[PDB]
């Protein structure tokens, strides 16, 4: 596509997109075009508005485009073209990516006892309500545990909420503790969001006992 | 995929899918699995049910799966595996395709006068509310008009309703009437549904006058 | 989207799209934009060309866009904007839909004997190499057989070729012949293409014997 | 979906997926099923193989599934079900995610001079050949620069190679340097892969002069 301003918009929240170059108040020669999950290719929106699109995205007095409550289908591209009172045309180009933050992740079915030298189920980490899916990962004593290295194995599951579309992730950790190791290790699980710069979320630790 | 029974399900209507081989009433060893626009790959549904899926698809006393109001995202594959009281396992495999019937098509901006030997805009046909999109076509004196043959031009547009997903189609017809032709031709437009065996819908005719 | 000329382009064949309004030969102020399965949103192509796109779509001396061999990923929208020597701007807007014609359909595993009053497997119809998928249907004595009416049942299967993407369809017909019926019925199967105005293809008939 | 082992497979490289529980050499009662970008829902692959799938994915003597050169369309789910010589059934479930590493990122059009207190174009960072797309970000003196905080502006562009599908990313940085700031700041750009635990790639720094 073209160069654009990246916009990250949280599901359910309003979004206001600026029409660069527009007169501050009507009358305004401006047009918005958007290609999102709602549209077949580009849809043009005008200041007068009208129709079912009024429920979804409407042009404000100052020419900005307003969505009262962003949803997954609003992901896409939003563009404005305006003329000011002199006649200079100005373009605005936005790439809108939608997200939701899940609840704090939780560990379920955690083991209280591990045996060294054999594979053990440590626990299952669960995260509910993310978009995009994101990923879960495990840590041992503040260091990331890497699947398929050093007796670590992980299995993963992804489900979607049937009405909201939001993701639930599950991650099952097994480890083979090394003989003569730490007898009270500390494990935890973290959720890493899909979009850049969004913060990770972490579970409470679990501290099994390891038997030599 | 595998062999399946094709099911066509109208948007907004209920759908009941039979679990072949299931005992007529509980207790029943049966499981439904579905992969639709709602799911990440396969989702398993059990007779006890539970959770958010209860709002969408639930197993009936006789083991059938019930959706109170089908939507676009229920398109996909629905399977049942049952054991009867003896131990015979029986599979059910359904490919569910969703549709909606648009309103009767309408011609707008129809021409009252055509000039022979030059291109004329005859009219614009509009169909609102279909799924899948379907197509519009034009007829002249009960015979199909073929675009880019014999001085016929057609342009087409597709839009989607922002909340329902249903399609609105527009088709603009231009013709160059042949000299010495019928002076009161009869044009009409038809909507052809996307799914097989669904009936076409037709507009009222228009009867312009052609000037030699 | 906007009004456009519909273009149907057969896979593997060349496609030439006209840039309306362009000067017949260089120099030409024209630009092509396309959004297809190959692109992230819109890609701009210029007369000078250059790069990997030269292998796929290149601007001709007369300003038309040339694709030497259309593929499934060329489905999408293709637009031109040209200025003539005076300064009139002219737009060209094309919606390109790709297709392939399968081989003639064939019936396999046809039954030689049917018993009246009980369900019988009549045969399996197979079509290989279509795009879009299209559909198969059955006929009895030159009339369409409707699944789930009058002792008819059909099961269907769709597969894709792993490298070409083209569809293979299979359709299994079972019928319960009515007692005292025609003792040498004639069945056949037809492939119906997905795009409008494309012709159906039909199998050779089969003529089982029916036993009262 | 179900619990699965996550597999990350580099485009163009071979992939071997183990059929857990299978006998070490024929005869083997095992079956692979896969749902990927190549398939319409599930495709079953058998030890005898055969057909066009032999070019893509074939079962080895030890029952593993072998793809000689993974492509984007092999993303998806791969399952095995085996019985050993005793009769024990064993399942294998793999979620295969494909990737490619881009070339080292490069800064182009870098500025030699910045003026403090006014917006300046610092440069454009480009990354070629990634899958999935991944993201670019900017750093100032070893700290991440956050768009739309403290006089920082970023615009982004994504394109796809028309034949390979791989992504090229561009990121244009503008900054308003703070008065009385460091007169020789150090900027750099980093590519962050889409999949977890894959390493970032970083550009050589640029060191413009800032004029008070
Ligand atoms: O679900 C729904 O129904 C729904 C959705 C969104 C929504 O919020 C809004 C979102 C955007 C904008 C607004 C104000 O728009 C207005 C109100 C009054 C005049 C105008 C308008 C102005 C001018 O602005 O003076 N110049 C114009 C020039 C040409 C044509 C129209 C205008 C715009 C309200 C409200 C309801
Ligand atoms: O911060 C920003 O907003 C921003 C960031 C980067 C940026 O680079 C670009 C420079 C030139 C072109 C482009 C893509 O084409 C664009 C972008 C925006 C509006 C339009 C546009 C055009 C028309 O042009 O025909 N008609 C329109 C009618 C209605 C609404 C929009 C348009 C086309 C992108 C432009 C703005
Ligand atoms: O507005 C909408 O679209 C919407 C409407 C309703 C809604 O909740 C439902 C969702 C799905 C299906 C249904 C009903 O089928 C149902 C639902 C629940 C139980 C039964 C049922 C009854 C009995 O009913 O006595 N005995 C049972 C015994 C065994 C198993 C089931 C039942 C039948 C209700 C969710 C959304
Ligand atoms: O009219 C019909 O319903 C019908 C039409 C054609 C037809 O051909 C087929 C024959 C065999 C297999 C298939 C696909 O696999 C299927 C089909 C249905 C259920 C299952 C299944 C299996 C499991 O098998 O492991 N576990 C399950 C657990 C829960 C729910 C379903 C299944 C697998 C299709 C079968 C039924
Ligand atoms: O796979 C591949 O590599 C491949 C793909 C497609 C292909 O066929 C073609 C497809 C389209 C066009 C052509 C001629 O283009 C040409 C040849 C010579 C000059 C120009 C050209 C002309 C002018 O035309 O005089 N004015 C121009 C004005 C500005 C910039 C360039 C030109 C165009 C060849 C050939 C190879
Ligand atoms: O037969 C036909 O070709 C045809 C059929 C219907 C038809 O209706 C339309 C009327 C107006 C607008 C539209 C969509 O927008 C279009 C259509 C075509 C080119 C452009 C365009 C614009 C720009 O406009 O900024 N810049 C461009 C730069 C490069 C290449 C194309 C464009 C925009 C469609 C137009 C032509
Ligand atoms: O350019 C490409 O991407 C491309 C490359 C190669 C190609 O054909 C192949 C496709 C998939 C896999 C392979 C090999 O694994 C294979 C293939 C065939 C047989 C065997 C094999 C051998 C034995 O080999 O002795 N004994 C066997 C005994 C039992 C089962 C298999 C084998 C191993 C070859 C298709 C495309
Ligand atoms: O490390 C691993 O491999 C692994 C990780 C997690 C894991 O959890 C699961 C436990 C049970 C079920 C599942 C999903 O269903 C699966 C998984 C694998 C094969 C099958 C399967 C079935 C059939 O079952 O009818 N027929 C088949 C025929 C051919 C090929 C595969 C199957 C079904 C997942 C299983 C294995
Ligand atoms: Cl799910
Ligand atoms: Cl639309
Ligand atoms: Cl397939
Ligand atoms: Cl692109």
């Amino acid at each position: 596509g073209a160069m654009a301003q990246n916009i990250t918009a949280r599901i359910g929240e309003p979004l206001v997109l600026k029409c660069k170059g527009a007169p501050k108040k009507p009358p305004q020669r401006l047009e918005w075009k958007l290609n999102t999950g709602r549209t077949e290719a580009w849809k043009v929106l005008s200041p007068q508005g009208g129709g079912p699109w009024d429920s979804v995205a409407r042009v404000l007095p100052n020419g900005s485009l307003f969505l009262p409550a962003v949803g997954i289908q609003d992901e896409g591209i939003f563009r404005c073209q305006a003329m000011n009172r002199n006649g200079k045309e100005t373009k605005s180009n936005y790439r809108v990516r939608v997200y939701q933050i899940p609840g704090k992740p939780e560990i379920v079915d955690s083991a209280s006892e591990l045996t060294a030298g054999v594979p053990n189920k440590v626990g299952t980490c669960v995260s509910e309500g993310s978009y995009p899916a994101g990923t879960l990962s495990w840590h041992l004593d503040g260091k990331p545990l890497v699947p398929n290295e050093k007796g670590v194995s992980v299995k993963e599951q992804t489900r979607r909420h049937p009405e909201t579309g939001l993701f639930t992730l599950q991650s099952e950790l097994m480890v083979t503790p090394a003989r003569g190791g730490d007898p009270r290790p500390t494990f935890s699980c973290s959720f890493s969001p899909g979009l850049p710069r969004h913060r990770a979320l972490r579970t409470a630790p679990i501290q099994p006992r390891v038997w030599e």
Side-chain angles (χ1 to χ4, degrees), chain A residues 1-24 26-47 49-84 87 89-103 105-120 122-142 144-148 151-183 185-198 200-201 203-212:
Chain A
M3 284 280 174
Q5 162 76 15
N6 196 64
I7 295 292
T8 67
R10 192 167 176 185
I11 291 165
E13 294 206 345
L15 172 68
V16 173
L17 294 174
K18 174 62 178 181
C19 185
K20 288 173 178 91
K24 321 185 162 129
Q28 295 133 326
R29 302 170 276 160
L30 70 87
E31 206 163 64
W32 281 88
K33 277 165 38 161
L34 77 178
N35 184 349
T36 64
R38 303 194 192 270
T39 70
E40 181 81 19
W42 300 81
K43 168 65 183 174
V44 173
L45 293 176
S46 63
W53 273 97
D54 274 351
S55 303
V56 178
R58 196 168 219 232
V59 177
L60 295 172
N62 77 342
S64 294
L65 191 71
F66 178 61
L67 285 81
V70 162
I72 289 169
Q73 297 301 313
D74 295 305
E75 173 104 34
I77 300 162
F78 292 66
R79 294 175 166 185
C80 203
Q81 173 162 57
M83 212 165 337
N84 64 23
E89 297 241 78
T90 302
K91 290 170 165 43
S92 302
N93 192 29
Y94 299 95
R95 173 82 172 77
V96 174
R97 300 174 197 274
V98 301
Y99 70 102
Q100 185 57 277
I101 310 177
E106 297 172 39
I107 292 176
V108 301
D109 307 315
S110 55
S112 38
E113 329 294 336
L114 311 184
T115 307
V118 282
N120 299 258
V122 173
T124 305
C125 180
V126 181
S127 173
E128 285 179 353
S130 59
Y131 191 91
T135 53
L136 296 172
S137 62
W138 290 90
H139 307 270
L140 170 54
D141 294 329
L145 281 166
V146 196
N148 319 335
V152 167
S153 64
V154 175
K155 298 303 157 271
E156 301 178 337
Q157 181 166 28
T158 300
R159 298 176 157 148
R160 285 186 227 147
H161 189 291
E163 259 143 8
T164 66
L166 300 183
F167 291 96
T168 290
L169 307 182
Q170 293 205 16
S171 173
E172 288 190 3
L173 172 66
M174 286 179 88
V175 303
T176 296
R179 300 189 154 87
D182 170 13
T186 303
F187 296 91
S188 68
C189 167
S190 60
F191 172 82
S192 173
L195 292 177
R197 275 183 323 272
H198 290 197
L201 302 80
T203 68
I206 55 145
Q207 324 202 172
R209 301 177 299 180
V210 188
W211 293 100
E212 287 301 331

